[PDB]
Structure formats: C-alpha cells, structure tokens
Design a protein around this ligand. Structure first.
Ligand SMILES: [Zn+2]
Ligand SMILES: [Zn+2]
Lengths: 420, 442
C-alpha cells in the first residue's frame, strides 16, 4: 500500500495489489515512452511519459467506480470490481511502443503492412506477460480476486470483446465497461486532457471531480449506462472544447507530425540492423519486438538514442535523419487534403501512398522529377475524421514546387478535396 | 527568429543567434538529462529535463537585463550585452551529466577521487565545443558580437572568475549577477527551476518573478553596482525563500529520491569498466572519462541508464541487477542521518573512503553479523536576506527564517535482512561518535 504524489490529481492511494503490479519491469517500462511522442520536439513542456498518465487513469477509474458504488449500493459493486477497474486503468496503456501513437499508428503499418497491431492488443499481451513473470496471480487470490474471471475482465476493459459479448462480468454490470475505455467519455481522456494541458500551458476548464460527483447509473433502452446530471452539460461542453483545442493546437501540430514521420523514417532505415534480444535469447527487430513480450519490454524511446549514438556504418542513413531533427532541417510541408465521402485510407495501404503520389502525372511537365522515396504521406486520424498531409524530403525550391504538382494531381486522381 | 511555447513562461522569443546555438547536438543533448536526476522515480510528475529549464533561464536572463537596460540607460546596456547574458543563461547547464547533480555531485567523486570536475566547468568546455563544431563565431559577428571578448564574457557568467573578470569592465559588475549569483543566492537560474520544479511537483510557488524583475534596479552598494529589489518586494522575497525551503525539504532532499540517486551511481560504477563511448578521433572513453572529451560527453546522457538495464552482456550483470532492484522497488535501506556540526566538513576527495570508515567502526557491543565497506552507502548532501539589498522609491539610488544545515550525511545499507540493518545502525552510530558528528535520532 502506497501513496504517490501527482501534480494533476494530488495524493494517489494505491492498494498493495496495484503496487505489486506497478513495481515490475513491464509497468515501469512506461517511464521511457513519451506521452506525445515527437511533440516534445515542439512543446518543451511535454516531457511527460505514459507511466504517470497510467497512474492517473488507474486513480480516476478507482474514484469513479468507487463513487458509483457509494451513491448506488444496489449496483452491487464489490471491492473486487473496484480493484479490477483500477488495474484496467493502470494497465490500459502497457501496449504502447516508442513515441506512443507513432508506433502503432505509423511505424508498424509502414514496416509490416500485412500485420494488424494495436497498442490495446499490445496492452493485453503485456498485461499477461506482466502477470506471468511476476507471480501476480497468487497476490490477486490473496486479495479476493478470482484470477481467471478477473484477468479476462481486465483485458476486456482494455481491448473490448472477442447480444452480451463479455465474459468477465455479466450484463447487469455492463456499466463497469464504460469506465476505462468508452460515448468517447472515459477516465483515460480525463487524465490525458488534464495532464496534456498542464504540460502544454493550455487552460482546461473541464472539472472531472464534478462529473464524478454527479455520475449515476441509469437504464437507457434496457441497458445500464453511466449518465451525467441535467444541468451539468456545460462542464461537458468544456471537456469537448478542451478536446478540440488539444487536437487543434497539439495533436495535429504541423511540425509535431512532421517530426514523427522523420523518427519513423529513421526507425525504418534502422529496422534491419537494431537487434533486441527476447525470450530464450532469440533476436528481434524494432518491427518484430511486438511478437515477443520479453523483447517488447525493452523497446522504448531509448531506440531513438541507440540510433543517434550508434557508430555502425549500416546505421548511417537512420542516424543522418535523426541528426536532421537536431539541426532542425525538417521535411518540408507540401499540403493537406481529405478524402471525400466517408472513405478512410486504411493502415494496410499506408506504404502504397508515396508511390501513388510519385505516379501522378502533373499536367505541366516540371523540370524536376521526384521519386516515391522523396515523399512522405501522413494520414492523421482523429478517433473532420481523416486528414492527409504530404511532406517532401527534398528541400530545394525546385523539388518543392514539383512536389506540390504531384500532390495536387494525386488528389484529383483519387477525387480528394483539392489542396488550398 | 523563432518562438517557443513553454508552460512556465508562455511565449519565449528567441533571437536567430540563440536559435542557432539551440539547434545543435551539444544543446539538444539536454533533452536527455532529467532535471531532478533520480527524483522522477519518487515524483512521477518530474519528467522534465535540462533542455526546457535552460530555455527558461535564457528567457529570464534576457527579461531582467533588458528591463534594467530600458529603465536605467545610464548603465549603457547594449544589445550585444543582452545577447551575451541570454546566451549564458541558455548555456549555463550544458555541462550536466546523466541525472544532473548526481553525476558531478557523487559519481565522478567516487569514480575519480583525484579529479576536480563541476558541471559548470563542463558547461564552459561544452559551450566552447558547441561554438567550434557548429560555426557559431561568424554568426555572432553577423549580429554584432565580438567573439573574443564576448565568449569570455559568456564563460565567466557561467563558471565565475580587485576586479577579476576580463569579459566586461567593472562598471558592468551587475551583469555577472544575473545568470549565477553565488554571493546573494538570487539569480534567474533559481527562478526558473523554482517555478518549473514546483509545476512538475505540484507545490504552490507564490514567488512572482515578473513583478520582481519589474521592480529591480541597479544601485551602488559599498562601492559596487549591484542589482537591488524595491523595498516593498520583501513579501515576494519571503515567498521565494519559502519556495526554496519547500523544494529542498520535500524534493531535493527526499530520502527515497536520494537513495535512488546512490543506486544509479552504484550501477554506473559497476558498469564503468565495460561501457565505451566513442569520442573524438575514434578513441574510446568510459562513463567516468567522457568528461575529458566533449565529443564523447555529447553522447553521455540518461540513455546510459537504459543501455545498462537492457544489456545482456554478462560483464554488465552486476550493474544491471542494481538497476533492476530500482524497478522491483527493492531499494537500499535507510540507516540514519548525521551532520558535521562544529567540525570540518567532508570533501569530495574523501567520499570514496567513507564506507570503509563506517564498516571499520567498532560498536562496543560485539554483534553477530559483520558488514563490509561494500554493504554501506555514505551519501553526503550539501546545500550550497544575508546580502539582499533594497531601495526605496523616494531615494531610488541608495541601498537599504529557519536555516538549513550546511552538510547532511546519510548512510544506507545494501543488505536488506533485519539483523544486518540493526548491525549497520550500530556501525553508523559508532562512526558518528568517532567523527564527533551529531548523534543520530531514532
Ligand atoms: Zn491512456
Ligand atoms: Zn540551471
């Protein structure tokens, strides 16, 4: 049993079972993955990592579930349920890789387009690896938990299911599944909204303690849901204003997103040569460490500096891109487009995108002809739901003018909105 | 030109010459050195690094020197002066090593007791290395700086020295109290890290630095021009000293935080024969010798912690297992604290000898368990209105708590079983008596 002091939430009280889960290599790993990935290179206040965010989610999940239980004792929320919701909140982000959403949002689709990987699935596998490598099951049993049922409950809270599709808890407790990851209103967003604003200097006027006070479980369409009070909607709209401010000012920051693609580019040029030893001694690459949780345990933002400090000549190309970040010679912005309709470019097809741009035939024939390797195509998703930006690695005014020509034509070819 | 958004100071406008100093590998290296060292392992909000703090000192040094310049043209503060004071503020911490004060405060004294190293000497050497590796001298001249004098002025502002300085004459005495004031203890460096640390630690800081800068003036105090605060800022100054006191007592001197610093140092010492950092000309350096070559030093950051932790080399297993104790939270055990009240203080050159002294103390009641030097950690904790001069608004040209102990000594034990901890306490009590240090409290 411990208290951890956090600048966002103050004193965070942790049950002994939560402390045993936290003080493992699988959890402490999150200290080395920056929350905003490459955003730190734009926002110096944004040095925070997934670890303290995870503590905050575990704390918030516990407060909300405990407050529901005290106000409504008929829900039959047990102290076993509370701990399991806290574990899910603590562990929901175990699966993130180097630079957070850059890794599963961009790097893995570009290195292995045929593989389906999410950080959430990663959190389930890391959670299983954490449980199994630290003898956590006996400590769960020691504190009232029933491992087989509750471990499944925790995983379903993180990833969802595989008519009532959940096995960890029955349908009369369906509201427990809305706490950690939802409506789009869960305690995970509460923590990172507040924490990101604190680190970015952005005012945040959503008050989570007030939403907890007035949370109750009601029935809607013969289903139990967490609902807020009547006139408490204003606090709600303040949360959505903070969501949009954060998305507009930080998450979609043009230079932030460029730098992430540069880091990804360096990881790709390094993926053949970095070795990470996993289970039994087997060796893995950055792109295959997701296949072995012992190797994944050792895959963090440190990969950036392993490349940057390396001397192997084979890592020269990767190294040179990171060096371009330090000297601030970044890829150059070409323009932005959106797919019309409800069409979404799928992660599977990211790698094909630069080729399509280089295959466009700009009407006027430009002096400079560019190759698919000179183009970056950055697909920015939100949950306008998809934006597409193109950057060019060639800096000369000549290549940049040509790069815009390929980009403009490519949008027409796919009938995307025309660049402005 | 460029602008950087910072949560403490808001928009930080950066002159193009500062931008060119910042966008170098020597400066960006500060992104990989945590401000509080091992404190992050006790305070999850304290993920911040020396990079963002150095931007803030650069910013604050500029605001103060510009404010004095605009309100007191008689001081002849040039736009060249402002830039030099900004550069010094930006570059004053370039010399920190992995985990900041742990590195020069503890690791180098224990690894090379014969060397005299400070991060401030490091900052000068790294600043020089930054200048010459990135062609900064021409960019200086392009903006009106005279490199030979101005580089000297910048270095003296960082490291220190009748008038002993050569970068500026004595009539600009006051420029040397902006970035680093050892005499007074009130500089813009502390203003940033007070505000920044409180922000990441959730400690309220009532010191309002902008208001203090607004009312700062240069006045002659005993034949020297010195920066002075308006007399009505005494309440704001109280708030600064209360913040200083809170930070030292709750954070800088935290018991678990300091134990973790010694564990990391212990791991570096166990790894030091086996890590190699490639310096200039391809020559190989170690964690402890990377200070002798700024090319190797550029690549020595907190990364070394994970290099050790993720290693598979059987030669790094001992170092690696210490770092794993941190992750499992099986830390060294606190034994007690003492102070050398009324005695000569312990010096860096003697840190290495302390564990053998403790283990050699002869507790008069013989005990079962015998402990050796290697089971003991001896952690020496140094802390450093005395000379703060005021002025009144009517005569604007004529000048007008609970002191923390100078040196604290804590002892930790690596044996965790409880008979050994009892024995460690007996050795420690006897050692304090042997050295006429204060008797430890229960
Ligand atoms: Zn999260
Ligand atoms: Zn500093």
């Amino acid at each position: 049993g411990k208290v951890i002091n956090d600048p966002i939430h103050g004193h965070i009280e942790l049950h002994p079972l939560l402390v045993r889960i936290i003080d493992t290599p699988q959890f402490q790993r999150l200290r080395y993955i920056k929350q905003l990935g490459g955003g730190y290179y734009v926002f110096p206040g944004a040095s925070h990592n997934r670890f303290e965010h995870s503590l905050g989610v575990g704390y918030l999940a516990g407060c909300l579930v405990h407050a529901l239980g005290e106000k409504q004792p008929e829900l039959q929320i047990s102290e076993r349920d509370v701990l399991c919701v806290q574990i899910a909140g603590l562990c929901h982000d175990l699966g993130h890789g180097p630079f957070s959403h850059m890794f599963d949002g961009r790097f893995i689709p570009l290195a292995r387009p045929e593989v389906k990987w999410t950080h959430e699935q990663g959190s389930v596998m890391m959670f299983e690896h954490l449980i199994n490598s630290n003898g956590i099951k006996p400590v769960m049993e020691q504190y009232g938990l029933i491992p087989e049922e509750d471990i499944c409950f925790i995983k379903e809270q993180i990833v969802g299911p595989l008519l009532w599709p959940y096995k960890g808890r029955p349908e009369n407790k369906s509201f427990l599944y809305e706490i950690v990851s939802n409506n789009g209103i869960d305690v995970d967003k509460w923590d990172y909204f507040a924490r990101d604003c604190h680190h970015l200097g952005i005012q945040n006027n959503f008050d989570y303690k007030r939403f907890i006070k007035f949370a109750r479980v009601c029935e809607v369409d013969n289903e139990l849901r967490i609902c807020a009070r009547d006139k408490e909607v204003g606090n709600l709209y303040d949360m959505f204003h903070t969501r949009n401010s954060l998305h507009r000012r930080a998450y979609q920051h043009k230079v932030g997103n460029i730098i992430d693609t540069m880091i990804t580019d360096a990881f790709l040029k390094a993926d053949d040569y970095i070795e990470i030893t996993g289970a039994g001694g087997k060796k893995y690459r950055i792109s295959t460490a997701i296949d072995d949780m012992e190797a994944y345990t050792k895959l963090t933002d440190n990969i950036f500096l392993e490349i940057l400090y390396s001397t192997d000549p084979k890592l020269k190309d990767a190294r040179e891109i990171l060096k371009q970040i330090e000297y601030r010679n970044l890829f150059k912005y070409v323009g932005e487009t959106q797919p019309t309709g409800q069409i979404k470019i799928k992660r599977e097809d990211y790698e094909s995108l630069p080729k399509e741009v280089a295959s466009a035939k700009p009407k006027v024939l430009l002096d400079v002809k560019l190759k698919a390797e000179d183009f970056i195509v950055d697909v920015i998703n939100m949950d306008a739901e998809q934006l597409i930006r193109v950057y060019c690695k060639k800096v000369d005014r000549k290549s940049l003018y040509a790069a815009r020509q390929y980009f403009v034509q490519w949008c027409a070819d796919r009938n995307f909105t025309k660049p402005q």
